[PDB]
Design an enzyme around this catalytic site. Structure first.
Site, PDB file in Angstrom:
ATOM      1  N   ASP A 184       0.841  -1.194   0.000  1.00 13.45           N
ATOM      2  CA  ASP A 184       0.000   0.000   0.000  1.00 13.45           C
ATOM      3  C   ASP A 184       0.881   1.251   0.000  1.00 13.45           C
ATOM      4  O   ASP A 184       1.942   1.259   0.621  1.00 13.45           O
ATOM      5  CB  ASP A 184      -0.890  -0.003   1.242  1.00 13.45           C
ATOM      6  CG  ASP A 184      -1.877  -1.149   1.244  1.00 13.45           C
ATOM      7  OD1 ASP A 184      -2.347  -1.532   2.333  1.00 13.45           O
ATOM      8  OD2 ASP A 184      -2.198  -1.661   0.151  1.00 13.45           O
ATOM      9  N   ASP A 203      -4.361  -5.823   2.919  1.00 11.38           N
ATOM     10  CA  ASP A 203      -4.301  -5.047   1.681  1.00 11.38           C
ATOM     11  C   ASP A 203      -5.353  -3.939   1.754  1.00 11.38           C
ATOM     12  O   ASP A 203      -6.532  -4.190   1.520  1.00 11.38           O
ATOM     13  CB  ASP A 203      -4.594  -5.967   0.486  1.00 11.38           C
ATOM     14  CG  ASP A 203      -4.383  -5.283  -0.857  1.00 11.38           C
ATOM     15  OD1 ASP A 203      -4.229  -4.048  -0.892  1.00 11.38           O
ATOM     16  OD2 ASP A 203      -4.381  -5.990  -1.887  1.00 11.38           O
ATOM     17  N   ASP A 232      -4.147   2.052  16.134  1.00  8.56           N
ATOM     18  CA  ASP A 232      -2.880   1.333  16.143  1.00  8.56           C
ATOM     19  C   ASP A 232      -2.086   1.268  14.836  1.00  8.56           C
ATOM     20  O   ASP A 232      -2.645   1.105  13.747  1.00  8.56           O
ATOM     21  CB  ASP A 232      -3.135  -0.091  16.650  1.00  8.56           C
ATOM     22  CG  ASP A 232      -1.869  -0.901  16.781  1.00  8.56           C
ATOM     23  OD1 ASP A 232      -1.028  -0.561  17.635  1.00  8.56           O
ATOM     24  OD2 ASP A 232      -1.716  -1.880  16.024  1.00  8.56           O
ATOM     25  N   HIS A 236       2.082   2.208   9.269  1.00 10.33           N
ATOM     26  CA  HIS A 236       2.136   0.992   8.461  1.00 10.33           C
ATOM     27  C   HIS A 236       0.826   0.802   7.699  1.00 10.33           C
ATOM     28  O   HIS A 236       0.621  -0.224   7.051  1.00 10.33           O
ATOM     29  CB  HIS A 236       2.357  -0.220   9.368  1.00 10.33           C
ATOM     30  CG  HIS A 236       3.499  -0.060  10.322  1.00 10.33           C
ATOM     31  ND1 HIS A 236       4.817  -0.068   9.919  1.00 10.33           N
ATOM     32  CD2 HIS A 236       3.517   0.114  11.665  1.00 10.33           C
ATOM     33  CE1 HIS A 236       5.598   0.091  10.973  1.00 10.33           C
ATOM     34  NE2 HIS A 236       4.836   0.205  12.045  1.00 10.33           N
ATOM     35  N   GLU A 262      -1.492   6.341  16.767  1.00 10.39           N
ATOM     36  CA  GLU A 262      -0.132   6.188  17.239  1.00 10.39           C
ATOM     37  C   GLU A 262       0.786   6.059  16.042  1.00 10.39           C
ATOM     38  O   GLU A 262       0.869   4.998  15.422  1.00 10.39           O
ATOM     39  CB  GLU A 262       0.054   4.962  18.138  1.00 10.39           C
ATOM     40  CG  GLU A 262       1.540   4.682  18.376  1.00 10.39           C
ATOM     41  CD  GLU A 262       1.815   3.731  19.517  1.00 10.39           C
ATOM     42  OE1 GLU A 262       1.430   4.055  20.658  1.00 10.39           O
ATOM     43  OE2 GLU A 262       2.423   2.666  19.273  1.00 10.39           O
TER      44      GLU A 262
HETATM   45 CA   LIG Z   1       0.427  -2.559   6.724  1.00  7.51          CA
HETATM   46 CA   LIG Z   2      -1.825  -3.509  -1.297  1.00  9.28          CA
HETATM   47 NA    NA Z   3      -0.851  -3.673   3.013  1.00 10.17          NA
END
Ligand SMILES: [Ca+2]
Ligand SMILES: [Ca+2]
Ligand code: NA
Ligand SMILES: [Ca+2]
Length: 481
Positions: A184, A203, A232, A236, A262
């Site tokens: 991503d 995803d 959370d 990422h 966070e």
């Molecule tokens: Ca991730």
């Molecule tokens: Ca993806």
């Molecule tokens: Na991902």
């Protein structure tokens, strides 16, 4: 009134299933101490009963179904959880639920998936050709069935994993192949795209995933009547996804739904880019300030207290920052350990509780202590600070960050809060004194140290100035006697 939240948990809480019961029975107390909102630990089923919750196995199992060798979660059952939320609500306290959407762990079964290996230090780079691996991506939820939701997870709902059951190899990160499959984008750039972290990575570009987590978000909010979220691992997660997920939940429930993400990176510029990309629709934990407090407490007094707020989020973005001293990430023993030393902890709490900027959070580990790592309960030192925030921290503020050891600030108080107004002073080195202005209209008043550290009184002169004192390595918050 000054809002104050509390992270009602730490990493080493006991696995006795009585935490919701404790929260329930602590509600009245919290209200009296000034807490207006409580962030509860992950309420769903983890990979085991022991799981703190971040393993995130089944988000629709709040300690209600027999899965992963247990019905209750580490904290208790769904019934006990609901009893805690009810208690907080009846005592006028808001409830912020934790949200884990970056990944899922403890898959019920495996699937053969075509994948490639990628550079762990640069996930944008593939280091192996395509080949089939046995990945833990099947989630059927045998114990729950279709109760609450019939959505089932499969490999295509994920971008990759870090384990191949067939060839059990260490230090690996697999990226799944498939049309449109890719890490991503608009996630932190460390390791060149930090989309992947642990377990099965979700995803965020798959349509079913987007719709499903949004549906879960509203179900979660309605089921527990949540008032907000603590999000959370946002660095990422696709930035635009988090922004839109929040808006969807707010739009669907109709509730404002406060949220604090966070974004754990001691990088102001990175956090600012995150706020920008999420259109500032939620706040972030002031991780940078945390490290400032940690370093000051670790400097033996050699830290330049004049710059303790420099580089923090609350300095440049006051209403988008949730200030905190410590949390489960920084407590002793954890990977990101950077625990603010106890001698400096009261100063740090005075910094986030008695200043007008930022939305402060009290750490359960600090308040009730962390028995497993010899960290004593510091509520006796935090209670007076919460009292100061609750009834005295109001009105115009004046800052005096003009000395490498002794700094401080004042609040003139306001007509809306009787006897409000204060003057906190602290020193990370030898004690001393500092003249500070609290307001000419306070002339003649006799103030005392609410922390009890200094036993005398300080009188405000005809010009509204008071010569406040403080002991070495301590803090004093003077208020109208
Ligand atoms: Ca991730
Ligand atoms: Ca993806
Ligand atoms: Na991902
Ligand atoms: Ca110093």
């Amino acid at each position: 009134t000054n809002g104050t939240m509390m992270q009602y948990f730490e990493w080493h809480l006991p696995n006795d299933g009585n935490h919701w019961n404790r929260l329930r029975d602590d509600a009245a107390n919290l209200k009296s101490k000034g807490i207006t909102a409580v962030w509860i630990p992950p309420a769903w089923k983890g990979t085991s009963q022991n799981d703190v919750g971040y393993g995130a196995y089944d988000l629709y199992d709040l300690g209600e179904f027999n899965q992963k060798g247990t019905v209750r979660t580490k904290y208790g059952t769904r019934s006990q959880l609901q009893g805690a939320v009810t208690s907080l609500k009846n005592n006028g306290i808001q409830v912020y639920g934790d949200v884990v959407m970056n990944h899922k762990g403890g898959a019920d079964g495996t699937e053969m998936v075509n994948a490639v290996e990628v550079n762990r230090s640069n996930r944008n780079q593939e280091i192996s050709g395509e080949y089939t691996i046995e990945a833990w991506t099947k989630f059927d939820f045998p114990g729950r069935g279709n109760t609450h939701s019939n959505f089932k997870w499969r490999w295509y709902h994920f971008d990759g994993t870090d384990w191949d059951q067939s060839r059990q190899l260490q230090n690996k990160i697999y990226k799944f192949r498939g049309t449109g499959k890719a890490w991503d984008w608009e996630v932190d750039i460390e390791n060149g795209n930090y989309d992947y972290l642990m377990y099965a990575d979700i995803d965020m570009d798959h349509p079913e995933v987007i719709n499903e987590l949004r549906n879960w978000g509203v179900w979660y909010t309605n089921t527990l009547n949540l008032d907000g979220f603590r999000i959370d691992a946002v660095k990422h997660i696709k930035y635009s996804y988090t922004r839109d997920w929040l808006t969807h939940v707010r739009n669907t429930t109709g509730k404002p739904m406060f949220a604090v993400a966070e974004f754990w990176k001691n990088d102001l510029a990175a956090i600012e880019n995150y706020l920008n990309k999420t259109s500032w629709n939620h706040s972030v934990f002031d991780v940078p300030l945390h490290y400032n407090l940690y370093n000051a407490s670790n400097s033996g007094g050699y830290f330049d207290m004049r710059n303790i707020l420099n580089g923090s989020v609350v300095q440049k973005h006051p209403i988008h920052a949730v200030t905190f001293v410590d949390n489960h990430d920084s407590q002793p023993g954890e990977a990101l350990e950077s625990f603010v030393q106890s001698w400096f902890k009261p100063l740090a709490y005075a910094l986030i509780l008695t200043r007008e900027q930022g939305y402060p959070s009290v750490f359960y580990g600090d308040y009730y202590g962390i028995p497993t790592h010899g960290v004593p309960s510091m509520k006796s030192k935090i209670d007076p600070l919460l009292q100061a925030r609750q009834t005295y921290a109001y009105g115009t503020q004046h800052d005096y960050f003009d000395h490498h050891d002794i700094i401080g600030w004042t609040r003139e108080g306001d007509s809306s809060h009787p006897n409000s107004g204060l003057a906190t002073i602290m020193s990370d080195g030898p004690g001393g004194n500092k003249w500070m202005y609290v307001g000419k209209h306070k002339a003649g008043q006799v103030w005392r140290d609410i922390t009890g550290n200094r036993s005398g009184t300080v009188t405000i002169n005809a010009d509204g100035w008071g010569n406040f004192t403080v002991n070495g390595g301590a803090v004093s918050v003077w208020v109208k006697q």
